[PDB]
Amino acid sequence: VAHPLPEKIIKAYLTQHERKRLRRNRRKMAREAREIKIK
Amino acid sequence: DIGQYIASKISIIAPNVCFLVGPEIAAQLIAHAGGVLEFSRIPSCNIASIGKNKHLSHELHTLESGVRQEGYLFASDMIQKFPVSVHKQMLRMLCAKVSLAARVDAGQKNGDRNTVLAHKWKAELSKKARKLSEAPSISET
Amino acid sequence: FTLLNRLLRLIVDPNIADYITAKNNVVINFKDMSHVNKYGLIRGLKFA
Amino acid sequence: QILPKIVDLKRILQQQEIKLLPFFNEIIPLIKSNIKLMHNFLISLYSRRFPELSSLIPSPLQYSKVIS
Amino acid sequence: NESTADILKQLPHERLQAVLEKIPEEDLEVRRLLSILKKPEVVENEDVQQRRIRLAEILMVDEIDLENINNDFFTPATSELIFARRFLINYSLERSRKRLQKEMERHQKFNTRQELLSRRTELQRMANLELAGSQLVSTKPISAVSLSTDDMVVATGSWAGDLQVLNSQTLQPLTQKLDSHVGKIGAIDWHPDSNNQMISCAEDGLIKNFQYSNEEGGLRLLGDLVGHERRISDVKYHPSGKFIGSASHDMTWRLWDASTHQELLLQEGHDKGVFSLSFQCDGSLVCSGGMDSLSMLWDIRSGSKVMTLAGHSKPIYTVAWSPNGYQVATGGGDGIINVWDIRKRDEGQLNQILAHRNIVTQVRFSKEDGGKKLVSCGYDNLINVYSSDTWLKMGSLAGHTDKIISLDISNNSHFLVSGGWDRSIKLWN
Amino acid sequence: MSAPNPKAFPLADAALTQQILDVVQQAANLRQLKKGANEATKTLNRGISEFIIMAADCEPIEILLHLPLLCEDKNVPYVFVPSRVALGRACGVSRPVIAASITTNDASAIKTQIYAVKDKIETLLI
Amino acid sequence: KGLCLRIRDDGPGIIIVVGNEKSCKFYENLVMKRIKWNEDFELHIKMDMHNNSISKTWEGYLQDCKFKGWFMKVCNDQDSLLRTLGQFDSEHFYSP
Amino acid sequence: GNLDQAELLVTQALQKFPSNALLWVEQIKLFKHGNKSSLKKTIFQDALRRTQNDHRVLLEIGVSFYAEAQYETSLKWLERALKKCYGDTWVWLFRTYARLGKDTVDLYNMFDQCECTPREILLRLMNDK
Structure with a gap:
């Protein structure tokens, strides 16, 4: 006879080395791109 | 007298640390910090200096192991059963696993004290020690 | 050395005697081989 | 007052030989501090006599016996 | 012309730059594709252009496709309970009729001068109070303080899970301290009659019934009470005295029997932890506080939720019940104390004290007199006193260096006892 | 999420957690941050610690x-x-x-x- | 959001501000620590306000803010003020 | 009694100011019988760095040695406290000398140049130990 009534109801970081690899690999693609575009 | 009394009943008060290092040592350790709590309050880098007798200028000590501080732990079983070159790395590796064990012992209720963390923690130490002693594979010319 | 640190503390203030005593342990390496020098003197040192 | 207390305490620990473990937790730092007070009190006695010994033999027991 | 744009296309920078233009440019759309793809929504410092480039890159590395392809029960049991339910019907009905008859007798006298003077005198006396003395208990803030019915002893638990008893009047040191098997104590309460028993709710999910023996420090366990999985935030006695309510976390407050030490009613219906519990003076209802900010009334004899009350935007910590029986007070981390007069039932509804600041911990009425004064204790370090009709803040009292966990007031209202974070119990005139 | 470990209290919600981890990195750049359980234990014994942060899933x-x-x-x-x-x-x-x-x-x-983060943390110890 | 009131001109008054938690802190820091209420000004004649002071009563959270915008007004009595708050059901915010 | 709460009060008070020279005087007075031998070095360092090291902290370190032992060590701390000067140091100076002896007579002119019965109070405080 008891009623069990019902209940009633971001960002991520990155380190210094990670910054380095992202920046290096980002600058390398662009630079090599300008190299082949010059050739 | 106190220290000898602790070694008898210690398997009750600190079952993990006596499982890793052994009771004759753990009794000396707990005996030093004067409890399980006060010993688990201790950072792991301060644990290796306990058995160290004293430092004096004329002692003339540089070990082949590279150990700067020889404590009650450096005489344990899990260290000196391995070759000499591995000792310096095992202290730092064992000391931590001792501390955590103590930090389990402070949290275990007095009525029921339980292991099975120290089993994994011997597995990691012994295996990782074999690995530290395993030496590189050969390289192609 | 246990005799040297004393004989040196006779002739010299202790800080220099301790330096001279501990400076001779070091570790000795030739390629593969390595040994700590407990006993003999290393005469390759300027003060030797 | 030291010996009647220490004899009663060692006789206490041999008599049972859980509730007394907190009293260990209290008594352990006290023992060490007292040992150091008395050791440092022996150095005060040997400042005139044999001064280097305090540096030579660090531990309180061996120092105390070498005194004897 | 082919080998010219083929090398240019084979190059990774151009291969990414061609993908960059075809992904749409807005904050929420860039963000939505990232959130769906499970990659980090935001990174430390980026302009939305750089975020868009992180779209392009992440699409390139994984070689994943384009955003095109990317996108109530009634449960029979326990007849033995149903007997106790009949008992609560008889008891609470008689007691209720008696209370309301008494109130009717009070409405007859009127004579506004007697009442208005009495209130003013009470307000001056409360504006007088200062602390007589503090004390020490342990090193852990003091989680619970409780006065016995005769107001001759205090009972204090703390975050250490050890409770000790004190002499109310004096406060020099204690009768005896006991260290319970349990770690962290939420609340404690005295049996309404004998003053031979306490009861303690603490973090282990176990509730201890203590036998307080004469002047002896021989406090003895009458029984242990089980069936809470989580920590228990509060425990109370049913004002009849046979039954013991308990409210904890697992969204279940349980109505229990003191004698048999049995679980009777397992109640459900809070979305989150149930932090508080209170019984009506008549023992008719029980009001329940929770972390879901929903104060929830319960008719114990009908097992039926009666009326649900949300005046709070944050967790409800303390639920105090008026000795008059037709009102209720709650308080929570929002720093507001809601007073609900259930009788009026249409519109006056809540009257909400703006209370303290920085939460509210315990709210309490005045036991004798039918209750007028409100004594509330928060983390503002202060303590407030409120009238029961004007609900105007009358006076506030600063004796504490730290925040206040717990408080009681004497039956005769001549001593205000408060523990807190400063680890000192402080007595107030 | 998984079942939040009952032994873990108080558990910061995501709105506060963003603020917490944010002040955490904001501290690390000023090297006002100590990291590790041992290196937090050092700051508690010494008494220079503001507030301790810990992982509920450890x-x-x-x-x-x-x-x-x-x-x-x-x-x-x-x-x-x-x-x-x-x-x-x-x-x-x-x-x-x-x-x-x-x-x-x-x-x-x-x-x-x-x-501010401490004033919001002390709110959850109740 | 919020409102501002007082009693006539020299009469005391109440300030209420609601919103995100970052702005409320900066406005509290405006009223209390920045602005000096005891400081004397020469009104368009000298005025000595040294007795005047500011105090915060409570701070907390709400289900909704019925304030549409922030506005300042002037009430002659203590009643029509409590009705001014009565429009927002805020009548209990004033503490006599 | 119960210096155990005194620890806590030093903490709460000490976080507010923080830099008061006195609160470090009691903080250092705590580790005497405070049974904590691990942190006393560090906090000494800390109490020196946070206080813009002050004659009162210096004095309490010197006394913290002398009370224990190593009367020669506390000479460096007390004498190092003098150079920033004020009567609280001279007593412990004359006690450390009173243990090491023979230097007392030459140091009296310094006590006059720092200034009645001061000379009398000195002989009153030499009779303490």
Whole structure:
């Protein structure tokens, strides 16, 4: 006879080395791109 | 007298640390910090200096192991059963696993004290020690 | 050395005697081989 | 007052030989501090006599016996 | 012309730059594709252009496709309970009729001068109070303080899970301290009659019934009470005295029997932890506080939720019940104390004290007199006193260096006892 | 999420957790942050700690459970944050970190933040 | 959001501000620590306000803010003020 | 009694100011019988760095040695406290000398140049130990 009534109801970081690899690999693609575009 | 009394009943008060290092040592350790709590309050880098007798200028000590501080732990079983070159790395590796064990012992209720963390923690130490002693594979010319 | 640190503390203030005593342990390496020098003197040192 | 207390305490620990473990937790730092007070009190006695010994033999027991 | 744009296309920078233009440019759309793809929504410092480039890159590395392809029960049991339910019907009905008859007798006298003077005198006396003395208990803030019915002893638990008893009047040191098997104590309460028993709710999910023996420090366990999985935030006695309510976390407050030490009613219906519990003076209802900010009334004899009350935007910590029986007070981390007069039932509804600041911990009425004064204790370090009709803040009292966990007031209202974070119990005139 | 470990209290919600890990990295750049369970334990004994942050998902969790007991003694606020990997990231480490300690500098620029986060943390100890 | 009131001109008054938690802190820091209420000004004649003071009563959270915008007004009595708050059901915010 | 709460009060008070020279005087007075031998070095360092090291902290370190032992060590701390000067140091100076002896007579002119019965109070405080 008891009623069990019902209940009633971001960002991520990155380190210094990670910054380095992202920046290096980002600058390398662009630079090599300008190299082949010059050739 | 106190220290000898602790070694008898210690398997009750600190079952993990006596499982890793052994009771004759753990009794000396707990005996030093004067409890399980006060010993688990201790950072792991301060644990290796306990058995160290004293430092004096004329002692003339540089070990082949590279150990700067020889404590009650450096005489344990899990260290000196391995070759000499591995000792310096095992202290730092064992000391931590001792501390955590103590930090389990402070949290275990007095009525029921339980292991099975120290089993994994011997597995990691012994295996990782074999690995530290395993030496590189050969390289192609 | 246990005799040297004393004989040196006779002739010299202790800080220099301790330096001279501990400076001779070091570790000795030739390629593969390595040994700590407990006993003999290393005469390759300027003060030797 | 030291010996009647220490004899009663060692006789206490041999008599049972859980509730007394907190009293260990209290008594352990006290023992060490007292040992150091008395050791440092022996150095005060040997400042005139044999001064280097305090540096030579660090531990309180061996120092105390070498005194004897 | 082919080998010219083929090398240019084979190059990774151009291969990414061609993908960059075809992904749409807005904050929420860039963000939505990232959130769906499970990659980090935001990174430390980026302009939305750089975020868009992180779209392009992440699409390139994984070689994943384009955003095109990317996108109530009634449960029979326990007849033995149903007997106790009949008992609560008889008891609470008689007691209720008696209370309301008494109130009717009070409405007859009127004579506004007697009442208005009495209130003013009470307000001056409360504006007088200062602390007589503090004390020490342990090193852990003091989680619970409780006065016995005769107001001759205090009972204090703390975050250490050890409770000790004190002499109310004096406060020099204690009768005896006991260290319970349990770690962290939420609340404690005295049996309404004998003053031979306490009861303690603490973090282990176990509730201890203590036998307080004469002047002896021989406090003895009458029984242990089980069936809470989580920590228990509060425990109370049913004002009849046979039954013991308990409210904890697992969204279940349980109505229990003191004698048999049995679980009777397992109640459900809070979305989150149930932090508080209170019984009506008549023992008719029980009001329940929770972390879901929903104060929830319960008719114990009908097992039926009666009326649900949300005046709070944050967790409800303390639920105090008026000795008059037709009102209720709650308080929570929002720093507001809601007073609900259930009788009026249409519109006056809540009257909400703006209370303290920085939460509210315990709210309490005045036991004798039918209750007028409100004594509330928060983390503002202060303590407030409120009238029961004007609900105007009358006076506030600063004796504490730290925040206040717990408080009681004497039956005769001549001593205000408060523990807190400063680890000192402080007595107030 | 998984079942939040009942032994983990208080557990910061995501709105507060963003603020917490954010002040964490904001501290690390000023090297006002100590990281690790041992290196938080050092800050509690010394008494320079503002508030301790810990991972609620640490397996086993019995290794960090002394820090609540030490913080109650030193009257230091402490919270649990849901995931140890994000806590490791905010500290600037690429590998999980189950405890961190914000130290005390009153001439620091981030003081006002740390006091706000403490005022919100002390709200959850009840 | 919020409102501002007082009693006539020299009469005391109440300030209420609601919103995100970052702005409320900066406005508290405006009223209390920045602005000096005891400081004397020469009104368009000298005025000595040294007795005047500011105090915060409570701070907390709400289900909704019925304030549409922030506005300042002037009430002659203590009643029509409590009705001014009565429009927002805020009548209990004033503490006599 | 119960210096155990005194620890806590030093903490709460000490976080507010923080830099008061006195609060570090009691903080250092705590580790005498405070049974904590691990942190006393550090906090000494800390109490020196946070206080813009002050004659009162210096004095309490010197006394912290002398009370224990190593009367020669506390000479460096007390004498190092003098150079920033004020009567609280001279007593412990004359006690450390009173243990090491023979230097007392030459140091009297310094006590006059720092200034009645001061000379009398000195002989009153030499009779303490």
